[PDB]
DNA sequence: CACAGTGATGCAAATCAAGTGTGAAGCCAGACAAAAACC
DNA sequence: GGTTTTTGTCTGGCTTCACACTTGATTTGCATCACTGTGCGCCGCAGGCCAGATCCAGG
DNA sequence: CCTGGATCTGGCCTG
DNA sequence: CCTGGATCTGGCCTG
DNA sequence: CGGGTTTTTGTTAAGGGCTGTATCACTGTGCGGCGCAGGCCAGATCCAGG
């Protein structure tokens, strides 16, 4: 959870809008993206 | 900015009339000024002037939404040509050609000047009679001749 | 990666990446509230409705001036709508565990999966400008991840899933976000109840949920354990941190740990801390404030989370190494034969250490501690540097 | 040539990072005075680079405009 | 840019990125010490060096335990 | 009048599937025949 | 003027690629919105709990 | 019984 | 003139 | 059933160049507060020498 804090003030500047109505939203998705395992087996589909 | 912040919060409590206050009476305009313009103007309490905040605040709309909170109609009528001065002198050592951006407001740069210094001098008495800021003297004292000298100030800025 | 794209087009031609939009309806597929799923009792006080991703997370709480004034901003998935998507990411990894642990993949067994919860506050954010509430400018942020997946096959379970980065910033999952303090109570639990409200109602279902062809059950198991001291005694009805009562696992005083400091069994739950808070509220044998907090050992206000008593790690680490810290300059300055000592000359023994730990384990000085700083703090290179500093040597024995 | 848009962040070229503070003044002149005297050498010459086949000839004019007035009271030698 | 470059090469069969030592190999062209160039009159105090890139900004000054102590570091560029 | 992001949205503009039957063009054949940049 | 190069030609006939249009039906590109940050410093704090020194007024 | 200097001392200007 | 409960208070526990 | 026979595919080692991966001491996310540092200057403010 505190690498999750490390990532999130990075999703917070960087992958969101930057209004107060839409960062919390953005930032929830990005971070549910990021981890996402079916986006992992690609980058080290080059271990195969 | 930040002077003209001290101007407003200065003027929310009548120094004029009451030249005396105590340091709490000031915090008390402060949070006056702070939550209003939070509620009217949409900017939140900042504690060092940055550039937005003096992009925002520097607005004619600032000061209608702060002559409400001042009783006197001279005060408002003081503050109202203040801010129109001054924004009629920001666009000459903002623009990064002036002469061939706004060349209107800088040939009478002198007037405007002088209209400003007046009416420091006169409605203002009770701050800049005898002291003055640094930058409120660079700004109506030097700048033509260094807009004659090289030809723009914003170009030659920091903000880099 | 708009102007990457970009750039890649115009200068070789043929399209090799793809542009924004397919990526948009592409990411759809993983976001929660696209697969269908259901819950065999079906759930309490929650709809059945399967296309519910980026919630709201204040519920529909009364917004109106009329009304407990609100400033905050929240939003959250859905609890069931995050775990299906969690597991229907983890499909291919489930069926390869499966294959590997020589099993079949046409199994529908009843698969348990435990998981794992985390919420802490984070400081220093900033509010933006502009329109909206009188935001805080601190955050909460409460999370999970999926720590293992077993199935029962015969009269055994096998595990076919166990993940290898139980601390990685990979693997836990984002499900609630707002802006609030982690001390205010109130919005906390106005924000918080219906995510324990969803998790109190799934402890006791089945879920059912197809994957590759097949439906298949899962059945949850939650811990609550990525929780600080801190938010242990907030949300469980406990005292603060510097009570008598220290334990968060165990009834005892701080008196009685320093004259036994072994022997002890964990003995506080959440059922017990709920019916302390009964008995601590109906006040059944009528006596005293002191002789009540005797009885209910510490509890005075409603447990509202359920979580398994456990120890962080990671605090662990730095409350130890901040002890150790005090232990160093408290021997150089040899306080067990000078008991008595002003302000400044612990301030000089606190810098002395300090040149001296920069001068031998290249550590700079900080005011709060660190976990690197406990891991190269808590070697023997650190007691050699110290002892050096010590001008006897039973002290050296003692500390090596 | 001209710097189309002057105040950017892609034309503000470095030259020089130190780990120092402004507040003190041996180790800024120590590490700035360098710059200085091969400013100063510059002031006075002619620059031959050879730019697309042709070798042709430069000379520069330095302006220190983007100092802040604590800067320039600190650096030029005027009062505080 | 090794993980974009090294899945993308994994997943395509082909090299659409170039692996980072050419990257590297690539990039000495625009560091500074690369061109010829003439000074005319050469400058005072400046060698007539022409590939010199990053140096230490301290410039040799004298870091002994007998005189001045200094803590800074500095990396710059030589001002031609 | 600082300036390059920050991502979702929505409107416009560009491309394309399809019929089948046309035009336009590259190019195979070996050989016959003028421009031209050096001695 | 020689010498080799450098382009030109032929007509019959072969494949190869563009287009004639239209009406959705996409896919792809680009503005638009209201904001961000870099513009300054400093140190232990906050929150809470509790043994122990002050204290202050009534017997 | 000042009183004329030493000496604080809080306000103001820039980051 | 006690003197024993009010009232600070500074130090220690977690972040 | 298997010698013949034609090709496939490999090894031999001395050099070369491109690409891949290990190695090195370090990072950050673990906590909160505030107007403050530095410098200058007019206005009180104190201190002993009569
Ligand atoms: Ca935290
Ligand atoms: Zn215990």
Not at chain 2, 31 to 41: P, Q, V
Not at chain 3, 308 to 331: M, R, T, W
Not at chain 3, 370 to 391: H, S, Y
Request: with cysteine; net charge neutral.
């Amino acid at each position: 959870n505190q690498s999750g804090n490390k990532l999130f003030r990075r999703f917070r500047k960087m992958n969101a809008r930057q209004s107060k109505c839409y960062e919390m939203e953005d930032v929830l998705k990005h971070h549910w993206l990021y981890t996402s395992k079916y986006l992992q087996k690609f980058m080290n589909a080059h271990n195969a | 900015a930040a002077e003209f912040y001290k101007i407003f919060q200065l003027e929310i409590g009548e120094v004029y009339k009451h030249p005396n206050a105590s340091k709490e009476e000031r915090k008390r305009w402060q949070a006056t000024l702070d939550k209003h313009l939070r509620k009217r103007m949409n900017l939140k309490p900042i504690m060092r002037m940055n550039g937005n905040f003096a992009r925002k605040l520097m607005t004619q709309e600032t000061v209608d939404a702060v002559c409400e909170l001042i009783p006197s109609e001279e005060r408002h009528e003081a503050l109202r040509e203040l801010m129109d001065l001054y924004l009629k002198m920001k666009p000459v050592w903002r623009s990064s050609c002036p002469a061939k951006e706004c060349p209107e407001s800088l040939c009478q740069y002198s007037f405007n000047s002088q209209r400003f210094a007046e009416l420091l001098s006169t409605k203002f008495k009770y701050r800049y009679e005898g002291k003055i800021t640094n930058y409120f003297h660079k700004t109506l004292a030097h700048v033509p001749e260094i807009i004659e000298r090289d030809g723009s100030i914003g170009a030659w800025a920091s903000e880099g | 990666y708009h102007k990457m794209y970009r750039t890649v087009k115009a200068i070789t031609g043929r399209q090799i990446f793809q542009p924004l939009h397919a990526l948009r309806n592409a990411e759809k597929v993983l976001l929660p509230g696209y697969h269908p799923f259901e819950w065999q009792p079906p759930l309490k006080n929650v709809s059945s409705r399967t296309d519910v991703g980026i919630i709201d997370g204040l519920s529909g709480l009364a917004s109106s001036v009329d009304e407990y004034p609100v400033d905050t901003i929240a939003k959250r998935f859905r609890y069931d709508s995050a775990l299906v998507s969690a597991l229907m990411d983890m499909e291919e990894d489930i069926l390869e565990g499966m294959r590997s642990q020589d099993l079949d993949d046409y199994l529908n067994g009843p698969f348990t999966v435990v998981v794992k919860e985390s919420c802490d506050g984070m400081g220093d954010v900033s509010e933006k400008h502009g329109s909206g509430p009188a935001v805080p400018e601190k955050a909460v942020r409460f999370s999970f991840t999926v720590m293992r997946i077993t199935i029962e096959h015969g009269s055994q379970n096998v595990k076919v899933f166990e993940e290898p980065k139980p601390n990685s910033e990979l693997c836990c999952k984002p499900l609630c976000l707002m802006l609030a303090d982690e001390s205010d109570h109130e919005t906390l639990t106005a924000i918080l109840s219906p995510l324990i409200a969803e998790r109190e109602a799934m402890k006791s279902s089945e879920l059912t949920l197809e994957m590759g062809g097949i439906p298949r059950t899962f059945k949850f198991i939650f811990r609550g354990t990525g929780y600080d001291e801190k938010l242990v005694r907030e949300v469980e009805g406990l005292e603060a941190s510097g009570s008598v009562y220290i334990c968060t696992l165990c009834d005892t005083t701080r008196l009685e740990a320093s004259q036994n400091l072994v022997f002890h069994s964990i003995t506080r739950s959440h059922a017990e801390n709920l019916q302390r808070y009964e008995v601590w509220r109906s006040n059944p044998y009528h006596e005293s404030v002191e002789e009540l907090r005797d009885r209910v050992k510490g509890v005075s206000a409603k447990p509202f989370i359920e979580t398994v008593p456990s120890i962080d790690a990671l605090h662990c680490d730095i409350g130890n190494a901040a002890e150790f810290y005090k232990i160093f300059q408290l021997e150089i300055g040899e306080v067990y034969k000078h008991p008595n000592a002003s302000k400044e000359e612990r301030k000089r023994w606190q810098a002395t250490l300090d040149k001296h730990l920069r001068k031998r384990m290249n550590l700079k000085p900080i005011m709060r501690m660190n976990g690197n700083f406990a891991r190269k703090l808590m070697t023997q290179e650190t007691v050699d540097a110290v002892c050096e500093l010590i001008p006897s040597e039973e002290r050296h024995e003692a500390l090596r």
